Amino acid sequence: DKPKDVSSITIIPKPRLGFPHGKGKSDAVAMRVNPVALTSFQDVSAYPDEPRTTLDIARIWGLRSTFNWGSGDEHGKELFNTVLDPGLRFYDQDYEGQITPMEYVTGLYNFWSGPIELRFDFVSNAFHTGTVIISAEYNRSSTNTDECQSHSTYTKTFHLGEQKSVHFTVPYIYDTVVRRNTASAYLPVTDYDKVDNVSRAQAMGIRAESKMRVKVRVVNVLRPVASTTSTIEVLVYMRGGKNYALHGLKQSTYWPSNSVVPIDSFPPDGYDP
Amino acid sequence: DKPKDVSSITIIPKPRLGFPHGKGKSDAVAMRVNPVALTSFQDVSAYPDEPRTTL
Amino acid sequence: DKPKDVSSITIIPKPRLGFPHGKGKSDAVAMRVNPVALTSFQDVSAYPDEPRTTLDIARIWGLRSTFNWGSGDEHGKELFNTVLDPGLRFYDQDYEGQITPMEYVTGLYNFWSGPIELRFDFVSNAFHTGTVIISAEYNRSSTNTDECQSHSTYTKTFHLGEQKSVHFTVPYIYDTVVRRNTASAYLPVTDYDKVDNVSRAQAMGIRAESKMRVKVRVVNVLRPVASTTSTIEVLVYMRGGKNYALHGLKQSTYWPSNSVVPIDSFPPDGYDP
Amino acid sequence: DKPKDVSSITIIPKPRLGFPHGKGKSDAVAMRVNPVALTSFQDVSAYPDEPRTTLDIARIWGLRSTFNWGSGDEHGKELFNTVLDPGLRFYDQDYEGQITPMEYVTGLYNFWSGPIELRFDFVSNAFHTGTVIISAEYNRSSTNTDECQSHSTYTKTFHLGEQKSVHFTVPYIYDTVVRRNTASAYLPVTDYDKVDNVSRAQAMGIRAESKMRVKVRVVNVLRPVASTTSTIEVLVYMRGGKNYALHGLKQSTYWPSNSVVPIDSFPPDGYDP
Amino acid sequence: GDLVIASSEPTQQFRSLTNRWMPINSIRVTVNGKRNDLLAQYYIPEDFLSTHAKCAPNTIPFETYVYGKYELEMKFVANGNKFQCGKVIISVKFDSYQADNINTGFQAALSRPHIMLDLSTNNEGVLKIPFRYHRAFVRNQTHKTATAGVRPGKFASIYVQVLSPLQTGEGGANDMFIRPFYRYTRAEFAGMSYKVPLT
Amino acid sequence: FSDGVTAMGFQSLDTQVSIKDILRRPVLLFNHVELDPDYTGFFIPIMPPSRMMQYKSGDKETSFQRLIGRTPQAAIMNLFRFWRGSLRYTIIIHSTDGHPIYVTHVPHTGNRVYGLMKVNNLHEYTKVPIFGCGLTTEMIIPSVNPSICVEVPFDTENNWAVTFDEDAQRNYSWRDKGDTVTGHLVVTPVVSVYMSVWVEAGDDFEVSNFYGPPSVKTNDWNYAFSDEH
Amino acid sequence: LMKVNNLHEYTKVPIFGCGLTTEMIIPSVNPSICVEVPFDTENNWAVTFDEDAQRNYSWRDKGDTVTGHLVVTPVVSVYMSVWVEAGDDFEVSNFYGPPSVKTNDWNYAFSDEH
């Protein structure tokens, strides 16, 4: 017998499946004998200390900056002063160095939120002593001469002694639930082209800068013994909080410039001497 | 083994799905990572005094 | 609500369905109102005597050949001698006559196998008498003078008397499980074109001829009464066995030549006087 | 009634199905009457001694090489010395002979692993006697003068006497889990074209040669009776181990050169005399 | 997993020879050092073979065997007076062949598994250094008859760097020293062969 | 010494050691060949690739692909002489047009041909097409789908088919000459148009009568650098 | 685009009909494709990057940057585009952390204070 097939359906043809989607379903064709055969990880697999998420990369301690503190530095003087942006280090000049992992990986996402931890380690002995404060200012900056304005903001005082470290949590209070990245989401200028207001007029986004500032002041001056150094150095470590968040994948802000060479066909391209 | 697929059906190709229809089914492609991920209204949602219909 | 359709599948487009296949599934479109409506056979249907298979057509008795037998015909003389091929009647000359149904329908298939029955009816009275033999020779033919070579092969002796018929089963013993048809599977030459070795060189197949032979000899000479005829006639009927088989559909060997006229459009083409 | 079909799905059209895949599903169209009809193997089927895998072809004993051993050959002298590569016999010259089945079929796969067995049969009588050793050296070769370096490696000493054979398992110890084939995976040069460094520069792969060596030395010299021969011959058989493995199908290394003639259309092309 | 398959013969341990500690040549730490400058760097186990600790009993099995797996520990000892202050970081980098120029920063040192030595408290530091190489085994020794395709004796690099420079008081010691120790916690050896001098 | 542990399934679960699974992977027969509508059509002999289809240095240039001999499939078929079962061909048209190309099976007749050829040396085949004679056929439409996967059956009188002979061009007995094939496949065009043909084993396929490796030759060493410069 | 062994003919001896695993594209049906190249090599892990791309170091360790190649073979001179993504079965390890970077994105945008 040869009966007819009465069943039918309306269909919409598409070129690919799950091409934008990172997960779901795939239209993949295996270049194997057995189409269900996959690469084995029975013997050799991932190591347990390795990160699974990009947030776990943002939970690694990285040296943000360092600064010196001396016995001549009077009370009220701003030792440290910056804009705590995980987006950019500077708004006004070129950067070239070894960026923190949390600022590196934040440079991939368009949006960020949550608290940002700072750990201040002090390069000293047990015979250095003196009091400093940690200030977190929102919606406004304080005058450098006026310490009293900074005392009103969210602060944490530390007494230098035997313990030469202090943990600190920079909170997250803004008008928005999430802050967006200051740097551009797409920059096609690669070869350091001379930029004018016409070129700035056709930017992909606008640099929505932040006026949030982290400052560290002298409460009581470093009064060391004569036997030890007068001018010590402070390590300022930084990572994302345990409730840190990221969203919206975009072009990377930072990009490697140290020891980069383009590839060439091995070994036709003059490899054989 | 490599057996043949004897199953088949007659199909009518169409460019779009639910293009005139305000409801029913959609041929939408999400520009996301997770294709089933939707915009949350768990915290911020509609206000109860607001109209649902044009009537 | 208007939710998206996430389901999808990879498809291979084909023009037709079951186009080579005689059975299975169909892509047919009914030119009716009701698509499931079929032609009724509730009242008018097939007759029970009619054949369902082509083998049942090959189980019909057809007159293969006739031959005369006389009182002058001495003992040992080959009365009948042929190559029993269901493919062709001759390998060497044109045929034009009323072919047997089993050879007709075998002319459609490329392959055949199984025993082939012969029924010899004798056109005589009860006052004709004389003994004949039925020989089936494989792998070799016998000399016409030497009856003793034919006696060694697969034989069946018949004593002519009151019963004027004999049934016989030609067996099937060859090197192969199935034999192929001698005639070509495709012949595009239609208008009796003069054929040379160049045209024979580009044949679709090679005529794998058979050296199997059916012979009937005189054991004891026909000694009739004077009152009746001296020279009688023998009908040689033939059909396929009950375990006859066919395989591999191909172009027909035979084709009608008796009273064939091409059609023309009725009635524009000069039908109205 | 004539209701509408509301069901639909998104589809991705592809030209073929299971074209790269050796197994899974097929888009085959049967050139038969019944589409589910397959070729029968009910009566005529495979023989039980025949191999099902290519590894079972690699478990057949093949003569790798032969070498002579004489009474003049002093102790410490390297009788046999080679690089045991299932890929190639030589790295430096043309080969033309009767290659072993395991090296033949290994020439198809890009990757190989597992132990390789050698069986040394000695063409002698029961009146030849003398001691030889079997050395397997990895990561380094020994000097031919210094037997003591070879004694440190993985060895097996055999005392020639009544038993004129010895089984041996060459182990598998390397830096990698699997070794790759030395010969190229694609060579489009067919007509023995004169090759230069420019042509060698655009090779599909690099010949990653092995410095593993199999050597057989004299421990105690062959001291036969005068009545028999002084110089005997040794058969060196070889096959893959029971845990031998192959992977990654590629172009064949070896290819037949003995009695090869191209086909031509039978019988238009001057077959009829 | 890769051990039993890649080696037909079973591997051997030499706990008496391997698990003992072994010093090397010292490290001078000056006040003249700047940030991200190398005090020391080592290509293990080659710099425990050729240069430092040649005639150690730990280097006895490395003559004869041509393959092995290597899990180490490295204890570092700092000794400076209480009137100094400085920070020294030491990290490890697995399969560092043709990757010494890049990810060599103190930032990468913080990111990779490391130890953090203060030079005033005079603490010690323990680097548990497992075996993570892109093959089953690493080749032990070079040889004049061996192939020149594989670079042996380098599955990891040690990096001793200034994290923050050493500062001293008035008329203080201008430098202090650090002595590195090492030992083998899991040393398995395959491919027995005739012995050679170590590089 | 210790036999050790196997490395099968260590990298991935893609085992390719089976004989049939090698034979089921397709091979290119004809690469970008012309179809002439003047003739009957292109003929393909129904046989797996082997030393029969092997190209030699400085012989007559055939329409076949040269490296067929050096394929794995032909190398396996140079170990076995007997084979039985259906085969699967994948045909690709180099066109987008509506003019269809009919593929028609021919069972075992006796002859053994290939390429574009006239049947019985006529000068007209449009009025008398081979595809409308009665034989089993399936058509290709380039405008819909320019590829196809047909499955030629094993329709012959033999328990096994001959893979290869010691000489291809030897004029020996004609009945045993035809055991190299199980018939032919016919490709019939409308206009002059290019195509390509691929071969692979059916689901139902078997090989037997193992001979082992013949005399071989190689020179692959010469066309590569070592890893010591 | 590259010649293999510097010949002057590849139609009679195609790379796609040598024996290797292949899948064909038909532009008239579907001009895209999604192939899945497997991990067929001898190494437990593959090398992502090197400190210098063009450095002529030992050739056996040079090849650990790849796991082979993919080959695209046309009929006529025709344009294409290639996209890369990870398989379902994919893994990364041996974490180094962020290298030395550079940026200048500040220079190509206005602030929100004119």
Experimental approach: cryo-EM
Residues F178-195 as b or e (16 or more Cβ within 10 Å = b) = bbbbbbbbbbbbeeebbb
Contacting residues of B for F203, CB less than 8 Å apart: 1-4
CA A256 centroid distance within chain: 15
Residue C102 corresponds to which tokens in the numbers above?
A: 């089993």
> Nearest CA of chain A to the CA of G12: how many Å?
24
| Residues in CB range of D143: below 8 A, 6 or more apart | D149
Three-class DSSP category at A151: helix
Q: Determine contact: B3 vs chain D, CB below 8 A.
A: yes
Neighbours of chain A (3+ CB pairs under 8 A): B, C, D, E, F, G
Put simply, the answer to whether G40 touches D110 (Cβ < 8 Å) is yes
Q: What are the structure tokens assigned to F195, written together? A: 């195509």
CB contact under 8 A, F120 and C180: no
Q: Do F4 and E4 make contact, defined as CB atoms within 8 angstroms?
A: yes
Residue listed under structure tokens 């959609």? B26
Q: Is C247 exposed, middle or buried (0-12, 13-18, 19+ CB in 10 A)?
A: middle
CATH class of F19-210: mainly beta
The length of chain D is 273
Give the DSSP letter of residue E61. Answer: T
Q: Contacts of residue B6 in chain C, CB cutoff 8 Å? A: 24-25
CA distance C129 to C135: 20
For residues A142 and A150, give the distance between their C-alpha atoms in angstroms, rounded to a whole number: 6
Give the dihedral of Cα atoms F155, F157, F162, F163; nearest 10 deg. Answer: 10
Q: Are G83 and G32 in contact (CB under 8 A)?
A: no
In sequence order, which ranges of chain F are alpha helices (DSSP H)? 19-23, 72-77, 174-177
Contacts with A27 from chain C: Cβ below 8 Å: 10
Q: Which of G17, G26, G28 sits opposite F65 (nearest CB)?
A: G17
C-F contacts at Cβ under 8 angstroms: 106
Q: What six digits make up the tokens of D212?
A: 């593993």
CB contact under 8 A, D111 and G43: no
Cis peptide before D13 (omega within 30 of 0): no
| B and G interact (at least 3 Cβ pairs within 8 A) | no
> Are E191 and D152 inside 8 Å of each other by CB?
no
The answer to whether A4 contacts C21, with C-beta atoms less than 8 Å apart, is: no
The secondary structure element, H or E, covering residue C157 is strand C154-160
The neighbour count for residue F7, using CB atoms within 10 Å, is: 23
Q: Which residues contact E195 (CB under 8 A, 6 or more apart)?
A: D152, E63, E64
Q: Which two tokens stand for residue C146?
A: 């030497």
Q: Say if D16 is an interface residue toward chain A (CB within 8 Å).
A: no
Residue D46 in contact with partner chain C when CB distance is under 8 A: no
Cβ–Cβ below 8 Å for A259 and E102? yes
CA end-to-end distance (rounded Å), chain G: 50
F41-45 and F115-117 as β-strands: parallel, antiparallel, unpaired? antiparallel
Number of domains in chain A: 1
Strand E138-139 to strand E154-168: parallel, antiparallel, or no bridges (unpaired)? unpaired
Q: Taking CB atoms and an 8 Å limit, are A3 and C25 in contact across chains?
A: yes
Q: Residues near D240 by Cβ (< 8 Å), separated by ≥ 6?
A: D55, D58, D59, D86, D102, D106, D114, D116, D117
Here the tokens at position C273 are 């006087």
Are G21 and A32 in contact by the 8 Å Cβ rule? The answer is yes
Q: How far apart are CA E144 and CA E199, in angstroms?
A: 10
Residue type, F8: M
Give contacts of F 173-212 with D, CB under 8 A. Answer: 174, 177, 202-204, 206, 208, 210, 212
Closest-CA residue of chain B to D12: B13
Provide the 3-class DSSP secondary structure of residue C56: helix
CB contact under 8 A, A40 and F9: yes
Q: Is F124 part of the contact surface with chain E (CB cutoff 8 Å)?
A: no
**Beta strand pairing status for D29-30 and F147-152?**
parallel
Q: Is the dihedral of CA A28, A32, A36, A40 positive or negative?
A: negative
**C24: its two tokens:** 């299975």
Contact status of B44 with chain D (Cβ, < 8 Å): no
Q: How far apart are CA G50 and CA A260, in angstroms?
A: 10
Distance from CA of F203 to the nearest CA of B (A): 6
End-to-end Cα, chain F, rounded Å: 36
User: What residue in B sits closest to F201 (Cα-Cα)?
Assistant: B2
Q: Is the dihedral of CA G93, G98, G99, G105 positive or negative?
A: positive
Interface of G with D in 4-63 (CB under 8 A): 4-7, 10, 13, 15, 18-26, 29-30, 40-44, 59-60, 63
Would you kindly state where each structural domain of chain F is located, as residue ranges?
19-210
Residue of chain G nearest A43, judged by CA positions = G44
Distance CA E21, CA C242 (A): 95
Interface of D with E in 210-229 (CB under 8 A): 211
3-state secondary structure of G107: helix
Contact F21, F164 (CB under 8 A): no
Element housing D146 (H / E): none
Contact D26 B14 (CB under 8 A): no
Quote the tokens at residue F51.
């030393």
Nearest CA in chain F to B4: F203
* Chain D: closest CA distance from residue G22 (Å): 5
Length of chain F: 229
Say whether C148 sits in a helix, a strand or coil. helix
CA torsion, points D68, D69, D73, D77, in degrees to nearest 10? Answer: 80
Q: Are strands E175-192 and E114-118 parallel, antiparallel or unpaired?
A: unpaired
- Are the Cβ atoms of C18 and A25 closer than 8 angstroms? no
The residues, ordered by sequence, that sit 6+ positions from D219 with a Cβ below 8 Å of its Cβ are D75, D131, D132, D133, D157
CB pairs < 8 Å spanning A and B: 47
For E36-174, strand residue ranges (E) read: 38-45, 65-79, 84-94, 114-118, 124-129, 138-139, 154-168
Q: Which chains touch B (3 or more CB pairs under 8 A)?
A: A, C, D, F
Range of the domain at D44: 1-273
Distance, CA of G80 to CA of G72 (rounded, Å) = 10
G73 contacts in D (CB within 8 Å)? Answer: none
Token pair for F162: 């001959």
CB distance from G67 to chain E under 8 Å?
Answer: no
Distance of residue E2 Cα from the nearest chain G Cα, in angstroms: 9
Interatomic CA distance for residues F108 and F157, integer angstroms: 8
Which tokens is C185 given? 């599977």
**CB of A197 within 8 A of CB of A102?**
no
| Chain A: closest CA distance from residue E163 (Å) | 9
Nearest to F218 by CA among D103, D209, G13, D253: D253
* Closest-CA residue to D67 (of D118, D138, D141, D142): D118
Angle (CA) A190 A191 A196, round 5°: 90
For residue A94, what are its two tokens?
A: 């070129």
As a whole number of angstroms, the distance between CA C262 and CA F189 comes to 28
Closest CA to A149 of A76, A69, A73, A222: A76
The DSSP call for residue D191 is: S
Could you give the C-alpha distances from F73 to D251, E100, F48, in angstroms and in order? 10, 47, 8
Structure resolution in Å?
4.1
CA distance F159 to D241: 35
- Report which of C53, F16, F46 is spatially closest to residue D111, judged by C-alpha positions: F16
Q: Which residue of F has its CA nearest to D253?
A: F218
Does an interface of 3+ CB pairs under 8 Å exist between E and G? yes
Determine whether the interchain pair B4/D10 forms a contact, defined as Cβ–Cβ distance below 8 Å.
no
Q: Looking at beta carbons, which pairs linking F58-63 to residues 24 or more positions away fall under 8 Å?
A: F58/D191, F59/D261, F59/D262, F60/D262, F60/D264, F61/G12, F62/D262, F62/D263, F63/F30, F63/F33, F63/F114, F63/F115
Element (H, E) at A57: helix A54-57
Pair of tokens at residue C222: 């026909």
End-to-end CA distance of chain E: 31
Please name every residue paired with D81 in a beta bridge, in sequence order, or none if there are none. D215
- Euclidean distance between CA atoms C56 and C48, whole angstroms: 13
Across A14-153, where does the E strand assignment appear?
29-30, 62-69, 78-82, 95-97, 109-113, 116-123, 130-137
**Chain B hits for F24, Cβ within 8 Å:** 2
Question: Distance (Å, rounded) from C-alpha G11 to C-alpha F31?
Answer: 7
Q: Do G26 and F146 touch (CB under 8 A)?
A: yes
